[PDB]
Ligand binder design. Sequence first.
Ligand SMILES: O=C(NO)c1ccccc1
Ligand SMILES: O=C(NO)c1ccccc1
Ligand SMILES: O=C(NO)c1ccccc1
Ligand SMILES: O=C(NO)c1ccccc1
Ligand SMILES: O=C(NO)c1ccccc1
Ligand SMILES: [Mg+2]
Ligand SMILES: [Mg+2]
Ligand SMILES: [Mg+2]
Ligand SMILES: [Mg+2]
Ligand SMILES: [Mg+2]
Lengths: 357, 357, 357, 357, 357
Amino acid sequence: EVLITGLRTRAVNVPLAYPVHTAVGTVGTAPLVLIDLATSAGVVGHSYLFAYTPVALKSLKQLLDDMAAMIVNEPLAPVSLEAMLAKRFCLAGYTGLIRMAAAGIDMAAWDALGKVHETPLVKLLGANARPVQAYDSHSLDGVKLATERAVTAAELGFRAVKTKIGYPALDQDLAVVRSIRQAVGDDFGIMVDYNQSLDVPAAIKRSQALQQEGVTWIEEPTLQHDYEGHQRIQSKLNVPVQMGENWLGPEEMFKALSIGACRLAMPDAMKIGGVTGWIRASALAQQFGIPMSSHLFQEISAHLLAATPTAHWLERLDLAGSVIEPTLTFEGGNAVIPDLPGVGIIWREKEIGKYLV
Amino acid sequence: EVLITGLRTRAVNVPLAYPVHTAVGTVGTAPLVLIDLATSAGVVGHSYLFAYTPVALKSLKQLLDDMAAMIVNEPLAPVSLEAMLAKRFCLAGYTGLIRMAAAGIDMAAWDALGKVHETPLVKLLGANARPVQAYDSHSLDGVKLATERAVTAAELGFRAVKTKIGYPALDQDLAVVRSIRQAVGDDFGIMVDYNQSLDVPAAIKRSQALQQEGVTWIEEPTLQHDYEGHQRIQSKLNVPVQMGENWLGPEEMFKALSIGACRLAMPDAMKIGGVTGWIRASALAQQFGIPMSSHLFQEISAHLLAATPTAHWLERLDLAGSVIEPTLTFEGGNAVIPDLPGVGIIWREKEIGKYLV
Amino acid sequence: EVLITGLRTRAVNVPLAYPVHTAVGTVGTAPLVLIDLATSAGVVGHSYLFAYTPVALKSLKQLLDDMAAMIVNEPLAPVSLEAMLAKRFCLAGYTGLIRMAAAGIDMAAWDALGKVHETPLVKLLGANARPVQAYDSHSLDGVKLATERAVTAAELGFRAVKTKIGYPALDQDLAVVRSIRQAVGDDFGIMVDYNQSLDVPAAIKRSQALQQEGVTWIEEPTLQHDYEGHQRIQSKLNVPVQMGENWLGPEEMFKALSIGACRLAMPDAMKIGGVTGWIRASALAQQFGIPMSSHLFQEISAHLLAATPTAHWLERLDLAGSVIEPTLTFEGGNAVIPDLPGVGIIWREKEIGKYLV
Amino acid sequence: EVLITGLRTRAVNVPLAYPVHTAVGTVGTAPLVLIDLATSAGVVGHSYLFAYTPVALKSLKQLLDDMAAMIVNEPLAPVSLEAMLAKRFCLAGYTGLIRMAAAGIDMAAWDALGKVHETPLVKLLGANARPVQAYDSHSLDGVKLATERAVTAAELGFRAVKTKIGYPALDQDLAVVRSIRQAVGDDFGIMVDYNQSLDVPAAIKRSQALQQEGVTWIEEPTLQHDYEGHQRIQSKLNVPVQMGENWLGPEEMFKALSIGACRLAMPDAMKIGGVTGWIRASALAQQFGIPMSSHLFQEISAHLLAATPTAHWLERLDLAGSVIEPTLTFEGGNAVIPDLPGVGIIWREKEIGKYLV
Amino acid sequence: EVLITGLRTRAVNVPLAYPVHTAVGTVGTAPLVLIDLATSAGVVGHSYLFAYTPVALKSLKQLLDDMAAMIVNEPLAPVSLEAMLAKRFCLAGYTGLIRMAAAGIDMAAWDALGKVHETPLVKLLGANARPVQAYDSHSLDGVKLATERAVTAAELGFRAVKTKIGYPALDQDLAVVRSIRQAVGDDFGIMVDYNQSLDVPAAIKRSQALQQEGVTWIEEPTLQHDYEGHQRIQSKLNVPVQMGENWLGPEEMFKALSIGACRLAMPDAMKIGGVTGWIRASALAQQFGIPMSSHLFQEISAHLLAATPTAHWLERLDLAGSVIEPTLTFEGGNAVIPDLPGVGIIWREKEIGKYLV
Ligand SMILES: O=C(NO)c1ccccc1
Ligand SMILES: O=C(NO)c1ccccc1
Ligand SMILES: O=C(NO)c1ccccc1
Ligand SMILES: O=C(NO)c1ccccc1
Ligand SMILES: O=C(NO)c1ccccc1
Ligand SMILES: [Mg+2]
Ligand SMILES: [Mg+2]
Ligand SMILES: [Mg+2]
Ligand SMILES: [Mg+2]
Ligand SMILES: [Mg+2]
């Protein structure tokens, strides 16, 4: 009886203060699709998608725009909507860009639904808002910049940072991780991220050396889809293997966890299938005894983690900061959910115009 | 910021038109605990619990009343509340009557939360109301009465019935199913329930005979906790083994499904952990590819099934009809969710006095 | 040193004589992306992609056009090109539409490489052209039309047909298969395809009924990604379960085969990763002892099957006949590779204008 | 021919010298249900139940009182009695409070049966009394108190102590364990108990550090029901993982041991199902090669361990000391079974009146 | 339409500068069968076989000569040819010398096919030529010679060497490996090869000691066919176990990898089944997440590795240097594919006459 009455998308390419250097390439800007889901209640649901590379940006927007025809005039009922989209894309493949588009809709629909009820999303999911510990997420920065960003993060109150590694030499990975340790002291988390850049034996070798340095976790040591390879790496480690950002739907998470690919999980609110997929993922993580963190989408992830029984860390990487009001705050390194209906995303309408593609 | 302000319980032992005869004993009356959860928003959540035997009835109500102090002044946030209860009871054992009590609180809290937002529970969960196919659930009734109840159910538009079996002789099981089949015809579901009465070999022998007869499923053939035994029974059958009414929390369901105990599941809204446990349960049934039905608690299960990705059947067994307004209805054998906020449970306050224990 | 010098795409929505009705919806038209890969040797590679639904069509073409910059001036070396694309897209997700796009490029590059050496693709792969047995692939056509199409296919020399099933009732599935069987006789293959429409228990029940009827294989009985569910279905059957058209890359095929999901495979030349993915796929089917058929893309699949150690059937479903010269022919039900360099795809340039989206 | 002729229960709330602080909450008093089972032989069987929290105390007593109706007038035959109770509670769930109540009956019935035959329980089970090594069981006490209690225990002749850990920081766990080591010297056991307070990766991390300190075992590192999680923790340890106090019946122990959850077991005489369940548990522990200790109930556990083929340690935590005569003694840290019929429990009738609820 | 028109073989016994001493015997000379495959295109395909021992040399040549009857007049289509040979030797056993003979034909046929198209083999397989890192492969040389050869290899630009170990005492293995380390410095690979000489426990013991020295891999620690034994050794190592040179066909590799025998692979271009088998092996190595190196046959292996998705190292052991022109070069320790059609093998016709048997 509340119906979806419009979908508007905007492709933006937002320059970042700190380009996200990885072992497999640099993300120099954030290509985002900003989503507005109009309703017959008058409120408008907001979400966004991260396209990773500009190469995928216009394709993802086009996809969403063409998907509008299947959602406009449907009830604002995110779970029913997700089931209908799964069905419609049964043949084409309910994964990749199609799944990402469906998730952006889902996240906007839940924001709208929080607005219909005039309640923060976390409360609509039946949980209380609580502060959620966050790590400041850096990149493949080299010793000088990694040291400078680590000092800044510690001054801001964060109790952990993540760096991206996978330099040509292991000694280079170690050099950056040790330099960070000098900047932050011994009572402080250092997560490390390989971004899929190693083969299994190289990952076992580099990971055991990193484990001697006392890192908090080792994230995507090898090809994301290779769950058996992850398991093989994990079998040789005391430190936990972390993955999940590339799981497309909870069904991919289920396969990973069923064979013991990792001891931590971090679904991406977009890839996992939005709020609807995330809640399913949290049910899996709970049964499999897996502490569950977030990947990007800090705005919605602060809500989702508060509803997550095995909630672990929130990834602070502010991809949408240039176009979204800073209503999400950080007190003593913990993300604090703003007291606003739905997700608490408010567009910076003047700023958006600068970045339109 | 809606708070819980009070808890009231009432223990009743309600007469049933048809005593529930099973192979392991008769439930001749319904021992229920009726729960009222008061809130600072002025709305009152309702739910009830089934104690199975009057022997457990006063103990269950006493437990609930002693739990009142731990929930009064807590936010009305059923997910956070469930985590607090899991923690408070982790030494004593968060299972059995304690888990049942926590579930009754959970179902009242979600009823209340629905009332806070003036919305049916199904919509609060992000799904659309839809009619849910229901089977009319009977008992170990003997040939004559089973056949009558089946005809009557067919006349009312039900497309399936369940009968409870496990007579002293397999011939008797078969004579009951055959007489039902002759009276309802070939295009009609007949589910059967052994209520845990057989050892594994007897279950294989009886179940293979029933499979030759055409039954819709075979339910709890052996001891409920014996998941491996169920798996052994299932391995000898084409017809699906059904279970789940006895799973206490989604963690028991997870263990049963992890080893292939059954091809169908039917969690009990109370034993699975209320709405909170049910939603986690539905995530599991989806990943494991298990069609998921309900057990008892028809009033809330109509809502819950509507939000369940692998929704199968609703069990129609009206344990609480003597004390609850008939707002749930059946059209062509399908449960129709009432257009009322929360669950649509309204006490028949005139009738409750008759049955107070 | 042959280089890629340009990429051109054209999106078309081509009418089909017979809409492809499936249990999960109808593909009434063929949304295709037609690909031209220009090279510094003056030859032009051709391939096409199938978008399944017009909803994905513009997005897919936009993605391809945005990929033009990353392949222009790269050597015409399809294997090296595929590794570069896997790497460029490893963050975004080398699956779904992105993987499909990479595959379309791959098939054009191999077409081009064949033209560079003036040799049919099959011979470039180190194999001899041989006739490949083909089944005529039909749809959820109802009794009358299915029987007509089967007779017609028999008259044309096909030794098998595939019909799509999953009618509301199992009786309907059986009535269609029976009427086909009476009309084509005992010595004739009837494949059936459920198009992911059944849950596991329904698939076991329906499949065991069809097996009693004599069918050649049972295809995608359940959700395509549910490899474990397929394994459960297969374990209850003598008749082979068939799948693979939805595997995105040989890595998905590897996971499905590793757990015994099916006894037959049919990769889709586009989804499996083009010629490069197909060849890897054929290595896997060989080791796992899986007879391997094709899905769609009949023009290139005739070449690919000829080089496939466990080659089984070619699927005849002419999605692109309206825009591609009929150089592939059928003699006594067998696909005959044209004596032309590369794939033997020649555009009907007069007809393409009619269907441009 | 000897019959049960009465059941009397008394709820008591007994203040403890040393409140049992755990990582998941404090047990400040012992809420017990004292049980007297009258017989036609005139002797009265004595046992008690531990309710863990006062919240559960009145519910458990009520449950027992209502259960009296099923046991009065039954033969005093604990094994037959247990089978009847299992049956009666088949539907309600023979676990949790119901199972605990059944176990209290069973323990009283075996005490009575020892009295009928004028023989210590251990001799009735067909074993000789032998001294059984005991550890003095402490709590989450901090460095000052842990040190003081450790010194006292060593002076009393105990050769091991247990402390409860799970402080906010690992360095705090280590600090307490090391301080204890200073108080007791190097030839002395220090067991440690996490009381379910850690997730799997935190447990692996903390446990490997504790293992470097030379602790005797690591008890319930994670959620008690999560056997797979325990196994995962155990797989990374040389030190044994200890659990079992929360197994409700030998059927829960069987599941744990079947998947290698732990290398030690310690059933709780109440939760395991009393004497009847304990003897079954000991048969399992023997076959699985698991040294079996006791949890609480030191009075009866001294008998049961003497009949246990893989008997390991007795937990000395004197919960019922204020209301039971000190007939169980300790010589050189070994529990010495008193020469008294049955269990050797004699009520302190004057003391009981002070603690009645 | 291009046909095989002749096969000529020449048995040669070529003295080596450095006899290949192994723990199981010395290879003092290289017994090779040089192969020329004449075609109707006029070009002649070249390959060679390594017979290992002179004892096998004349038998292998005779075998090839008798096999000529099945290939002459067949199309030059290596994949079709391989399938025909597999069939013809179905009964006799398509393994050992027979398989090796088939592989020599296959390698010559692909060389010829590269020549027909006037293109380097690597380009015919659809890949670009790239430099491939090579290690200089030494033998069971003792400290003096191992040191001298290690210095030479480092001067030549190689970044790794392999030595063969399995001396009577472990201290001798360690002495040679440490002496090599002194000669090459710390930033340099030392692979070690046991040539099947140890039993599983001896291999675990020696391997853990070698692992402390920092060797790059441990190759064939035990009997080549004992995959389960390899797995057992691998289970106790962080350093990777390397094997594969003795896999006869990709079907043997598949079995090894299916049970986790090793974390690295190195097929032998001859034993694996030539180019046709190698491409299949590379598809397996990719799916199993196994970095794949080469064994001997450096001329063709430089091509094959460039087409190998998980390409690791090229083994530089120049067995055929005395009879093949040095068109393969090494720049900074990387093998550089010559710009010549096919494999780039050109006979030293004057040199061959000196070594004929
Ligand atoms: O792997 C990543 N994050 O954890 C990542 C990758 C690209 C951009 C931002 C983050
Ligand atoms: O097994 C049962 N139902 O499916 C059942 C048992 C007791 C009372 C009501 C129902
Ligand atoms: O399932 C299928 N084929 O086998 C199919 C589906 C859609 C269009 C064409 C074919
Ligand atoms: O975990 C425990 N003991 O080993 C425990 C818990 C509560 C009270 C007494 C003991
Ligand atoms: O094991 C070997 N190489 O890696 C080997 C064996 C004999 C001759 C040459 C090499
Ligand atoms: Mg990451
Ligand atoms: Mg039942
Ligand atoms: Mg199909
Ligand atoms: Mg304990
Ligand atoms: Mg070797």
